[PDB]
Design an enzyme around this catalytic site. Structure first.
Site, mmCIF file in Angstrom:
data_model
loop_
_atom_site.group_PDB
_atom_site.id
_atom_site.type_symbol
_atom_site.label_atom_id
_atom_site.label_comp_id
_atom_site.label_asym_id
_atom_site.label_seq_id
_atom_site.Cartn_x
_atom_site.Cartn_y
_atom_site.Cartn_z
ATOM 1 N N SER A 37 0.792 -1.084 0.024
ATOM 2 C CA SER A 37 -0.161 -0.592 0.294
ATOM 3 C C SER A 37 0.650 1.093 0.182
ATOM 4 O O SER A 37 1.863 1.593 0.772
ATOM 5 C CB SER A 37 -0.856 0.198 1.051
ATOM 6 O OG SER A 37 -2.152 1.411 0.886
ATOM 7 N N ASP A 85 -4.980 5.141 -3.480
ATOM 8 C CA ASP A 85 -3.853 4.879 -3.462
ATOM 9 C C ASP A 85 -3.915 2.930 -3.920
ATOM 10 O O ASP A 85 -4.534 2.548 -4.841
ATOM 11 C CB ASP A 85 -3.084 4.482 -1.610
ATOM 12 C CG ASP A 85 -4.159 2.673 -1.074
ATOM 13 O OD1 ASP A 85 -5.291 2.710 -1.668
ATOM 14 O OD2 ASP A 85 -3.364 2.354 -0.154
ATOM 15 N N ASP A 142 -3.370 -0.495 -3.132
ATOM 16 C CA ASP A 142 -3.297 -1.593 -3.508
ATOM 17 C C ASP A 142 -5.480 -1.456 -2.775
ATOM 18 O O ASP A 142 -5.968 -2.177 -2.875
ATOM 19 C CB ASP A 142 -2.705 -2.996 -2.486
ATOM 20 C CG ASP A 142 -3.422 -1.904 -0.772
ATOM 21 O OD1 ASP A 142 -3.535 -0.153 -0.507
ATOM 22 O OD2 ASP A 142 -3.042 -2.242 0.288
ATOM 23 N N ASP A 197 -7.142 0.359 -0.760
ATOM 24 C CA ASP A 197 -7.521 0.253 0.326
ATOM 25 C C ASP A 197 -7.957 1.596 1.509
ATOM 26 O O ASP A 197 -8.886 1.765 2.487
ATOM 27 C CB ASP A 197 -6.669 -0.879 1.442
ATOM 28 C CG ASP A 197 -5.521 -0.064 1.778
ATOM 29 O OD1 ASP A 197 -5.237 0.832 1.438
ATOM 30 O OD2 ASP A 197 -5.505 -0.246 3.442
#
EC number: 5.4.2.10
Lengths: 368, 147, 146, 366
Positions: D98, D238, D240, D242
């Protein structure tokens, strides 16, 4: 040969041929064939074995851990692997398979840029690095890491090649196919379909567990019965990785590699394409094979068992055709290793051009 | 205005077939009417997208031997037959596909992209001139034929 | 009229993929609106032709993971995803493609043709019923019923 | 000690080695094997160039102990959790790191329920990574693992998000910044299939350009892009997918506290906010709680890190939680932070109130 035997690295999967071992193979081999060019182009292919996926994952992880550009091919015969590695000017090619062996076994095989087995010096260095207990090889990071370009369409390239090596479409010929539940399962049924032949399939339904399971070139009796059942004109039995070919006549009898070699070399001489009218073969060939070769005025050179010596002889003397009793036939006019489907296409060329049935063509060579 | 979205598809398709060894021949109409050559292929009138182009130029397939012609931001037709260029000046490199591409550039203002089946190098033909060995961003910058 | 064409294209494409054992999944719309399923695939809105259909379902390609949707006499989109039917009357080991075909035929009036990548036999799905192993004239009569 | 807060993380090849990823896959699959002698672990990644190498090593490991592996391709970590739950699958793996730079990567694990693996399981996995003897079973022949790629899972996770919108967002111009990450293909499909005028940026990944001056951590590019295309709002996910950071039509940043306030206020206006409480961390701003009191919404505070936020939402059965980072959990629909879900809730508020994002965010004073 420590790790690199005759047919590359072989073992029973996970227990002997471990994914860790396949990872080290990919990494060290990619490094050794990297030296000159910054970012090699290794492409990789496999048979339908359930261990193929695990070994491919480990191999691609290794190859990317040293920056090699990796071109996955999916399921494709070893001939297709060699043809694509050559026709794409790639540094090396990998085939994860263990021809005709049971499903539990598997193996890694390497091809150079020319389409031939890796030089013994390169294999020697690969084994040298597999002994140092220190992975002191470069570990590229960020953008220096390996790159991946899946090319699952590659088959159809290798298909488009085979398709052009047919002197005409095989219209009006009933052919039964036994693909050993192997790599040729999707390929062959496509190929002879595009050549306008009524194909009857068997052993074309792989599930990762049924490869070479009472089918294929090593077990042609199933195809022998199937040909008589569907009253086909001939049956073709490839093996797991599609490098061998065993034919079956309309009568249901087996037509081994010696008879197919005789038939195809005789046809090529009838077209003048047979270079110097010689045929390379191994000690394993039958006496009557050479008898009929003499009867048709075809010289012949014999080498030790194993196809590396057959291709050594065809290399040095510039010979057109070579093969073994196994069905592993090399037509150096078109490819650099044994090609089941190519051999099948040559046999179909002979059948179509002479109009004789397979039994009559194979009867010209009398076994002792 | 949103023609950059289409250039993105064209560049991705051409870089995809170039990264491998997939022959390609993409013509794109501009001002000269190409209906005479459009009506020789398989009509599609399809929305563009890279995937359709890549699928069009795949080996073995039916409508892959020939050229697809791009009209008003739509793939008008595929497997069209283009006239070959009788001009000399280049032949040494085989031709066939390149010859057919160069032939249409004297007769039309079209910008024709080509991918070599042997090399994988991207070529372009415009106003009768054939530019060899293009980079990924050179072709992208080159494709600013749109205003 | 303009129904003899497109129908001819569909049968020619299906026989082409059947001889070569190429998996295929083609969903013809009639009265139920399937736009929610069209918007999940690669939009084409292309005129229907046998060659284009053959090119769509090539063994491994971006336009092969999914189903082709025919609206009007145009291939609206390709690589669209259909719901699975989870029915017991689907002969097992097949599924995947056949399951999606019967699943979309349970919800809609659509006529779904399937070509098996394992056998090469032509199958048809309507109102949740899946007829396997159809002949060329069986498919022809079925597509003239449309 | 391999499993930190965000699973196992390191810079690829040098620290997070493919050998390490293989050991992770193998030992984790053994730990998750105890029920049936063929677990169903599914695996997904972001657009990181190390994603392919780590995925290959991970799948090799998982198949070396018989686990059935379902590759997902490029998909957000929320999608991973949703698919692992909705498929009754034993575990799910995400190869990502992330918002970190492209050189870094990481492996993250989710149980069948959709939550981070129990600390007992992680403890055992680390126990096995200390014995210098790979004495775990090595299945052979048909006992080996099996893999049936399920690249379609995305469209499932998409089909889910699409139904969690109170109506299509017709007449709304929205700018998207997907950090060149997992949300690149998904989000652009989502808001376009919901009839919204989408303007994209950072939706062109190439394995090297993830989180490169784009994404939730670098929202200035999207800030300029919103004013350039005069969109109604901009959304910055972002790497990933999340987290979520919003940008109003004026170009100002709308952090996680403001989005939490907006969405919880709308949910209370629909009565869907459970007990009219919102869970958050110490890092939240004072004015956030001030406006929460002003709108009669109770609040529970936990320590930093989303495991405690979800711990509180777990025990007390709370509907909504989040952080200032943009990591928002709507337990009605998903079990971890979901950028696209948060975006859909924000768009729900926008559509239902018709107000602009600046006006909605001005209710909470920093």
């Amino acid at each position: 040969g420590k790790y690199f035997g005759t047919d590359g690295v072989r073992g029973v999967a996970n227990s002997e041929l471990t994914p860790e071992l396949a990872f080290k193979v990919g990494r060290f081999g990619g490094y050794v064939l990297t030296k000159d060019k910054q970012r090699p182009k290794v492409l990789i292919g496999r048979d339908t074995r359930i261990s193929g996926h695990m070994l491919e994952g480990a191999l691609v992880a290794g190859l990317l851990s040293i920056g090699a550009e990796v071109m996955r091919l999916g399921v494709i015969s070893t001939p297709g692997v060699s043809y694509l590695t050559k026709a794409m000017d790639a540094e090396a090619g990998v085939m994860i398979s263990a021809s005709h062996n049971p499903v539990q076994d598997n193996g890694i095989k390497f091809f150079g840029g020319d389409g031939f087995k890796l030089s013994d010096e390169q294999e020697a260095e690969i084994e040298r690095l597999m002994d140092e207990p220190e992975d002191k090889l470069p570990r590229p990071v960020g953008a220096d890491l390996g790159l991946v370009n899946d090319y699952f369409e590659g088959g159809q390239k290798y298909l488009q090649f085979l398709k052009q090596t047919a002197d005409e479409d095989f219209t009006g010929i009933h052919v039964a196919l036994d693909c050993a539940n192997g790599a040729t399962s999707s390929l062959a049924t496509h190929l002879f379909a595009d050549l306008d032949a009524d194909v009857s399939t068997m052993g074309t339904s792989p599930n990762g567990l049924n490869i070479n399971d009472g089918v294929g070139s090593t077990h042609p009796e199933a195809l022998s019965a199937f040909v008589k059942e569907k009253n086909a004109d001939l049956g073709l039995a490839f093996d797991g990785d599609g490098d061998r070919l065993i034919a079956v006549d309309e009568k249901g009898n087996i037509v081994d590699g010696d008879q197919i070699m005789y038939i195809c070399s005789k046809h090529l001489k009838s077209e003048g394409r047979l270079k110097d009218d010689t045929v390379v073969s191994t000690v394993m060939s039958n006496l009557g094979f050479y008898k009929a070769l003499e009867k048709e005025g075809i010289k012949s050179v014999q080498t030790a068992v194993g196809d590396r010596y057959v291709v050594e002889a065809m290399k040095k003397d510039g010979y057109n055709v070579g093969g073994e009793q196994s069905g592993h036939l090399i037509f150096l006019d078109y490819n650099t290793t044994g090609d089941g489907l190519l051999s099948a296409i040559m046999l179909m060329n002979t059948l179509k051009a002479t109009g004789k049935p397979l039994s009559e063509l194979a009867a010209e060579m009398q076994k002792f | 205005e949103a023609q950059q979205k289409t250039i993105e598809a064209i560049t991705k398709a051409i870089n995809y077939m170039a990264k491998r060894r997939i022959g390609a021949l993409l013509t794109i109409e501009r001002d000269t009417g190409m209906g005479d050559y459009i009506e020789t292929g398989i009509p599609l009138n399809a929305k563009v997208s890279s995937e359709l182009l890549i699928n069009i130029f795949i080996p073995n397939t039916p409508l892959h031997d020939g050229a697809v012609i791009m009209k008003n931001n739509e793939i008008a037709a595929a497997a069209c037959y283009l006239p070959l260029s009788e001009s000399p000046f280049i032949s040494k490199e085989l031709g066939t596909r390149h010859r057919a591409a160069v032939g249409i550039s004297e007769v039309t203002d079209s910008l024709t992209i080509i991918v070599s089946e042997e090399t994988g190098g991207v070529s372009v033909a415009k106003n009768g001139d054939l530019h060899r060995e293009l980079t990924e961003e050179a072709l992208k910058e080159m494709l600013e034929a749109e205003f």
